[PDB]
Ligand binder design. Structure first.
Ligand SMILES: [Cl-]
Ligand SMILES: [Cl-]
Ligand code: NA
Length: 233
């Protein structure tokens, strides 16, 4: 029942995708091989970038990242903003600045300690999550989300809770925390929505879809929500 319904949401969008639901993992959609394929994390990596940066005192949650006036890819990013603002706007240049502060050596050590994806950040500290070589499967993303939901990541409890505040996206009564991603600089483009529902049970999810040229960002939220509702939220 659920399997056919969720597959149809991806089919009707005329693209290929999967959604992972998590101690047991279930996979739904029209291309389940994607669950076992690694992709660039794109802006989903901001979750981990923020954790690493706050834990290591490279930024505070009240700090403003100033726009130095150079044009950015989106006018919505051409403003001064906090890490939380930049999380919501997926403001790449702010998190590139944070990554540079962390630096390649500390970033690589933390990524390996967390075990995030293939754990390979390469040699370029400020774009490895956008163009590779760092890649992650959707099942790996759901496991990261489930650990985050349970404060099981190797960071202080307070650091994890500070970053969660930046990711709380819906409250209704239960809570939904999530982070979108869109790898536009790879071909094909990859779309992500990774997070969890807090009902006291926690249910983690990761949607991974091929973003066809011109598709709206909202398709990620639309399929995710319809899928979770079909499954009973
Ligand atoms: Cl506050
Ligand atoms: Cl570059
Ligand atoms: Na990032």
């Amino acid at each position: 029942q659920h399997e056919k319904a969720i597959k149809s949401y991806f089919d009707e969008a005329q693209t290929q995708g999967v959604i992972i639901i998590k101690k047991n993992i279930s996979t739904y959609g029209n291309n389940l091989t994607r669950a076992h394929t690694e992709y660039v994390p794109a802006s989903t990596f901001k979750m981990l970038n923020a954790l690493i940066g706050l834990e290591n005192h490279k930024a505070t949650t009240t700090e403003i990242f100033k726009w130095d006036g150079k044009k950015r890819s989106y006018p919505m990013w051409e403003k001064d903003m906090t890490l939380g603002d930049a999380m919501a706007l997926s403001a790449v240049p702010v998190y590139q600045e944070l990554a540079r502060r962390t630096g390649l050596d500390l970033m690589q050590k933390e990524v390996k300690r967390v075990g995030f994806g293939n754990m390979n950040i390469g040699t370029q500290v400020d774009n490895f999550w956008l163009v590779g070589p760092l890649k992650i499967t959707p099942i790996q993303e759901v496991n990261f989300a489930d650990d985050f939901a349970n404060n099981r990541l190797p960071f202080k409890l307070e650091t994890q809770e500070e970053v969660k505040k930046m990711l709380l996206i819906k409250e209704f009564n239960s809570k939904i925390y999530a982070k979108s991603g869109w790898g536009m600089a790879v071909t094909p483009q990859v779309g992500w929505l990774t997070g969890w529902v807090e009902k006291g049970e926690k249910v983690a999810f990761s949607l991974n879809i091929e973003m066809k040229q011109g598709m709206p960002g909202s398709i990620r939220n639309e399929i995710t929500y319809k899928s979770l509702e079909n499954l009973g939220l």
